[PDB]
Amino acid sequence: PTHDVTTERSQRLQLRFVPVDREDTQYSYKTRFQLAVGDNRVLDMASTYFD
Amino acid sequence: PTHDVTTERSQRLQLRFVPVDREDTQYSYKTRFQLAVGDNRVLDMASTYFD
Amino acid sequence: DPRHALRDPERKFLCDRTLWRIPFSSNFMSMGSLTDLGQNLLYANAAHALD
Amino acid sequence: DPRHALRDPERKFLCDRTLWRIPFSSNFMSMGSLTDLGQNLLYANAAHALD
Amino acid sequence: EIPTPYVWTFQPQMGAAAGASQDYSTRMNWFSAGPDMIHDVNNIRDAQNRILMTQSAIGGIGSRQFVEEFVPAVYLNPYSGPPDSYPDQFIRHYNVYSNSVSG
Amino acid sequence: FTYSGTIPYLDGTFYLSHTFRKVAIQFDSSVTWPGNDRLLTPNEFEIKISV
Amino acid sequence: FTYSGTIPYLDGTFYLSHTFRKVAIQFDSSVTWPGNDRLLTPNEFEIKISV
């Protein structure tokens, strides 16, 4: 197909998010991210992971 | 204006070209460049110069 | 002078009573108080974080 | 062991009997022998140079 | 007034032709002539567009059927019309379903 | 406040703009701005280079 | 031709794909591909990083 499949405008394939807050406990580590899904986009969790 | 002015896709603002051929004569220096103007673009010579 | 000893160039500059600018426009130009990007849906629709 | 001396990690990999691929698709996926980009006017209309 | 017709280059593949552009390989130079000459040159050229005018009225298409169609079309005065009705199709990197865009 | 000279913060007598190296802007801690490979150094605004 | 071992060029017994660092593709010596800020490093395809 040559239309209605891929976008022509610029757009990253895989984004990278940094912890907006992180707490290093004596026996646990917690971090919170602000996973933002830009408009006209769709994210499939399965493709996400923690580096 | 919010349309029909700037492009959304990636694109450099100012390119840099390297001599495809250069001859250093005893009293003159000649260099040839292949100034390429990508499609959907317009170059205004006035904005060009030799570094 | 013939007595000149090997030296080394050093460049720098000064710009007082001025403020560095970084307009929030797609082309950095001023096309109105309310820039184009400042009116783009990507920003008015959802909130983001700056760093 | 307690007699262990300070070291340093070193990573690498091997991939034999294989060929690096870079499909000419907008999303790098295979949606048919005749890719989408391979059928885009920007290429069939005018000729370009590759480097 | 009297412009110069466009040329359509047949695309070996697809058969959907390509973008048309004002010919220049047969441009009859003459700015180095006289008044009556500069007058007659635009006359014979007008007759040309006149012929190509009648010759025009009368998957992808092959080459043999390409010469009969997609004939050189004269676009009279320049952009004249509004920003809505322009050549468009005369652009090489241009599609119908959407606006001219390339990767 | 043991100072009585000009107050750059009020009268606007700045004079330390020549002490900046580079500036990096990013939204959602991932999307660099302006990005889109606009500058020669798309990942930041280099005000001045030493080497 | 003083060799009689396997010929990777024919039998396809390649084994040096792990010796590549990066690849840069560009059209008309200006428009980088795929561009559009697709990859984390939109200006090239880094196969492997040392640091």
Side-chain angles (χ1 to χ4, degrees):
Chain A
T2 54
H3 58 306
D4 299 301
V5 181
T6 307
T7 177
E8 296 297 292
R9 283 193 289 293
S10 178
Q11 179 183 182
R12 288 289 239 300
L13 294 172
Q14 61 184 56
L15 298 177
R16 187 177 70 67
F17 303 114
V18 295
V20 304
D21 179 54
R22 42 191 168 186
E23 304 171 61
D24 186 61
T25 304
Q26 178 185 175
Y27 25 56
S28 59
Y29 193 59
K30 179 175 60 182
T31 60
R32 186 177 67 275
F33 302 67
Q34 56 176 58
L35 177 64
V37 181
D39 221 302
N40 303 300
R41 296 182 179 64
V42 294
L43 179 59
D44 187 304
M45 295 304 275
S47 64
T48 67
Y49 58 71
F50 291 112
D51 188 63
Chain B
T2 54
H3 59 307
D4 298 301
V5 181
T6 307
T7 176
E8 297 296 291
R9 284 193 289 293
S10 178
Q11 179 184 182
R12 284 290 232 301
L13 290 172
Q14 62 185 56
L15 298 177
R16 186 176 69 69
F17 302 114
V18 294
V20 303
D21 180 55
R22 42 191 169 186
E23 303 171 60
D24 187 61
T25 305
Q26 179 184 175
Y27 26 56
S28 59
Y29 194 59
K30 180 175 61 181
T31 60
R32 187 177 68 272
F33 303 67
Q34 56 176 58
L35 177 64
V37 181
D39 219 302
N40 303 300
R41 296 183 179 64
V42 294
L43 178 59
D44 186 303
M45 294 304 274
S47 64
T48 67
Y49 57 70
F50 290 113
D51 189 63
Chain C
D1 199 62
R3 183 228 294 287
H4 189 187
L6 310 178
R7 39 52 286 180
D8 181 299
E10 208 173 67
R11 299 169 180 285
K12 73 174 186 183
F13 74 80
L14 269 63
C15 200
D16 310 300
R17 65 204 312 180
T18 181
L19 303 174
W20 287 143
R21 278 173 165 290
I22 303 179
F24 193 62
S25 180
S26 295
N27 51 62
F28 300 113
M29 298 180 86
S30 300
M31 304 171 276
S33 190
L34 181 61
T35 61
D36 57 293
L37 295 176
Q39 185 175 52
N40 184 55
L41 301 179
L42 175 59
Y43 306 118
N45 297 12
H48 297 57
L50 181 56
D51 298 300
Chain D
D1 196 63
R3 184 229 292 287
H4 189 186
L6 311 177
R7 38 53 285 180
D8 181 299
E10 210 172 67
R11 299 170 179 285
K12 74 173 185 182
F13 73 80
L14 267 63
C15 200
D16 308 300
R17 65 203 313 180
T18 180
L19 304 176
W20 288 143
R21 279 173 165 290
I22 303 179
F24 192 63
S25 180
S26 294
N27 50 63
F28 300 113
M29 298 180 86
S30 299
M31 304 171 272
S33 188
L34 182 62
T35 61
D36 58 294
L37 295 177
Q39 186 176 51
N40 183 55
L41 300 180
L42 175 59
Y43 305 117
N45 294 28
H48 295 57
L50 180 56
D51 297 300
Chain E
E1 36 62 292
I2 186 286
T4 304
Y6 295 114
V7 61
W8 302 65
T9 59
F10 183 61
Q11 205 296 68
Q13 299 181 60
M14 300 180 89
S21 179
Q22 297 179 180
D23 53 295
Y24 54 115
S25 59
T26 59
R27 269 189 168 179
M28 181 183 275
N29 182 298
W30 84 120
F31 83 124
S32 180
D36 69 301
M37 188 107 91
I38 206 291
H39 165 294
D40 179 61
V41 62
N42 295 302
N43 182 61
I44 58 177
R45 182 176 300 179
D46 179 60
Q48 184 183 181
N49 299 56
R50 185 67 107 300
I51 307 176
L52 286 57
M53 182 60 91
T54 301
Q55 181 182 178
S56 181
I58 295 69
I61 301 179
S63 58
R64 173 172 281 75
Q65 186 177 61
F66 178 66
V67 61
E68 299 181 60
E69 300 297 61
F70 287 115
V71 302
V74 297
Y75 200 61
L76 53 166
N77 25 299
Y79 296 173
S80 60
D84 182 297
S85 299
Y86 276 139
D88 298 299
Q89 309 305 302
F90 287 111
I91 287 63
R92 56 185 67 279
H93 56 300
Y94 177 102
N95 53 179
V96 56
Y97 63 115
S98 182
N99 57 298
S100 60
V101 181
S102 299
Chain F
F1 189 57
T2 59
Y3 180 61
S4 61
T6 63
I7 302 178
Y9 179 64
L10 301 178
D11 53 48
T13 53
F14 310 104
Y15 62 108
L16 301 178
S17 302
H18 67 302
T19 62
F20 288 70
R21 299 176 176 296
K22 58 185 62 180
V23 181
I25 302 177
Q26 59 181 61
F27 287 118
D28 198 294
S29 61
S30 61
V31 182
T32 59
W33 192 81
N36 298 300
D37 187 55
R38 277 295 183 296
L39 309 175
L40 297 177
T41 56
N43 292 301
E44 54 186 57
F45 291 63
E46 302 184 302
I47 300 178
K48 65 174 185 177
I49 303 178
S50 181
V51 291
Chain G
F1 188 57
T2 59
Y3 180 61
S4 61
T6 63
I7 302 178
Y9 178 63
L10 301 178
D11 53 48
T13 54
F14 310 103
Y15 63 108
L16 301 178
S17 302
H18 67 302
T19 63
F20 288 70
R21 299 176 176 296
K22 58 185 62 180
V23 180
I25 302 177
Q26 59 180 60
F27 286 118
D28 197 293
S29 60
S30 61
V31 182
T32 60
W33 192 81
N36 299 299
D37 188 56
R38 277 296 184 296
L39 309 174
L40 297 178
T41 56
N43 290 300
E44 54 185 57
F45 291 62
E46 302 184 302
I47 300 177
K48 65 175 185 177
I49 303 179
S50 182
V51 291

